[PDB]
Design a protein around this ligand. Structure first.
Ligand SMILES: *Cc1cc2c(nc3c(=O)[nH]c(=O)nc-3n2C[C@H](O)[C@H](O)[C@H](O)COP(=O)(O)OP(=O)(O)OC[C@H]2O[C@@H](n3cnc4c(N)ncnc43)[C@H](O)[C@@H]2O)c(*)c1C
Ligand code: NA
Ligand code: NA
Length: 490
């Protein structure tokens, strides 16, 4: 009651929602991307606040501290476990939902932009395009991802071999800390500014907006999507790909999608068919690429084409807040440093992907720019030596049909253990997986030991520095969730 009274004093009441408010269910649901987490059995926030100004965010945080009510911040809602809007066990929290803070101001000549955290990637990309057809920003593939959680967790996509992760192309931030104080790079200092860019969402404060550098792309890029069934030699071809792809020139990224005994090789090339064709013949002739496979288009057009296969609907695909796609979904990830034996590829394609509840596997090759950054230079540690990332994705569409896919996800993770990274078994923070471990809270503070279990998987050798930084900027563990960085204090 007191917390709400505090809010009402400082924030316009139309931006405040209690469980009894008529619009609360729609506001809560508007960016829930996973039908597992929308149902009434999920733990719901006591209040939702939808700020439109940074002062609203500061007021909310100050009220939360004064009245000891914690806040989960939501930008795009894509968190794989829903931790921006639900808790795992009953507890009291408010959501600060940034969807109304969505401006993207592009300075084409300076090659910089300020992007509000509540913008979706498609809106960021589109605003860049409105400024220039030859500038880009290296972030994720799905247009509805929110900037805030994505950049906080790193963020990577079809430009990762060329320009690395989104967070290493951030040049400043505007951030509200656990005391309600407004910060930028300068006031924050090296440790906090290091941590916020890739050290995972929530833990390091609410980022209001991010300043990014914008990077050149050619006026024409080329996409291909070439599929090979096992009868067409998919096993031999993917066995070659895992060595070749991470060594290809930085201008060429060939990811793979597999969902049965067939692999689809999806390439983005920063160039034309005319130069791609001989490059493929020289470096990866096994795929059988020829000019009929080329799809030349602008960089901006590549975003809907890669994710959706659409050629013809730029604005509709990039400016989309309908939230129409809400699978029940489970996700896991792995990193690979040593090539799989051919027999493992045989089993993945012919056996694991033909089981009940089997998902899809996405393979993204590293090397080049992403792998050139030292492991400790940012919190994202999956760099030198990485051949590829694997994402294991399970979608289903009926409420009572979770058993088979959930079982498959666990079973394949067990099967893959000998072949992927170990000690620790690395995973990508933005492919959030609660089964990697969760925090224990003692005396109202997440324990260091519990955080380390999953934390070393996402952040490797960077976990301790993250936790020491957390201890400096949020010693009472105000901004937390079940898998946020615990404070390590003296
Ligand atoms: C749904 C979805 C996710 C994808 C997709 N493809 C991806 C890709 O091509 N590359 C990637 O690198 N990642 C991809 N992912 C995963 C997303 O990157 C993650 O799911 C992001 O974390 C999502 O960000 P957002 O949509 O903002 O999600 P939220 O649930 O709001 O937040 C996640 C996490 O971060 C905290 N947080 C939110 N907002 C902030 C701010 N402003 N400051 C600090 N922390 C913040 C939340 O509390 C939560 O913990 C493709 C698809 C379809
Ligand atoms: Na290891
Ligand atoms: Na999960």
């Amino acid at each position: 009651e007191d917390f709400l009274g505090c809010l009402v004093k400082e924030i316009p009441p139309r931006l405040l929602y209690a469980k009894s408010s008529p619009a609360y269910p729609s506001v809560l649901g508007q960016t829930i991307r996973n039908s597992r987490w929308s149902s009434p059995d999920n733990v719901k926030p006591l209040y939702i606040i939808t700020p439109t100004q940074v002062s609203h965010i500061q007021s909310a945080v100050v009220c939360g501290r004064r009245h000891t009510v914690r806040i989960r911040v939501r930008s795009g809602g894509h968190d794989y476990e829903g931790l921006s809007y639900r808790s795992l066990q009953p507890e009291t929290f408010a959501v600060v939902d940034l969807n109304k803070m969505r401006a993207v101001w592009v300075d084409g000549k300076a090659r910089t932009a300020w992007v509000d955290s509540g913008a979706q990637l498609g809106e960021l990309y589109y605003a860049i395009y409105k400024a220039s057809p030859t500038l880009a920003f290296p972030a994720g593939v799905c247009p509805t991802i929110g900037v805030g959680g994505h950049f906080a967790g790193g963020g990577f996509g079809m430009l990762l071999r060329k320009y690395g992760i989104a967070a290493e192309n951030v040049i400043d931030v505007k951030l509200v800390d656990a005391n309600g104080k407004l910060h930028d790079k300068k006031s924050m200092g090296d440790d906090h500014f290091w941590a916020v860019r890739g050290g995972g969402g929530e833990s390091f404060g609410i980022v209001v907006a991010w300043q990014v550098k914008l990077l050149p792309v050619p006026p024409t890029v080329t996409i291909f999507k070439i599929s090979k069934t096992v009868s067409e030699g998919a096993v031999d071809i993917i066995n070659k790909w895992q060595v070749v792809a991470p060594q290809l020139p930085a201008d060429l990224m060939i990811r793979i999608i597999a969902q049965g005994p067939k692999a689809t090789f999806e390439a983005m090339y920063l160039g034309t068919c005319k130069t791609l064709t001989p490059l493929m013949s020289s470096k990866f002739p096994e795929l059988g690429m020829n000019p009929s496979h080329c799809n030349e288009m602008s960089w901006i057009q590549s975003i809907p084409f890669v994710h959706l296969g659409h050629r013809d609907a730029l604005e509709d695909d990039l400016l989309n807040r309908q939230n129409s796609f809400k699978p029940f979904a489970e996700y896991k990830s792995d990193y690979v440093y040593q090539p799989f034996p051919k027999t493992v590829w045989e089993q993945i394609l012919n056996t694991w992907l033909v089981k009940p509840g089997a998902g899809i596997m996405i393979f993204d090759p590293y090397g080049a720019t992403i792998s050139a950054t030292p492991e400790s230079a940012t919190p994202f540690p999956h760099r030198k030596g990485v051949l590829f990332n694997i994402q294991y994705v399970n979608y289903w569409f009926a409420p009572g049909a979770a058993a088979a896919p959930l079982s498959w996800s666990k079973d394949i993770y067990n099967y893959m253990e000998p072949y992927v990274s170990k000690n620790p078994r690395q995973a990508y923070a933005n492919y959030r997986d609660i089964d990697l471990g969760r925090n224990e809270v003692v005396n109202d503070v997440s324990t260091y030991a519990s955080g380390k279990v999953w934390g070393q998987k996402y952040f490797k050798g960077n976990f301790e520095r993250l936790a020491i930084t957390k201890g400096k900027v949020d010693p009472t563990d105000y901004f937390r969730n079940e898998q946020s960085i615990p404070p390590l204090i003296k």
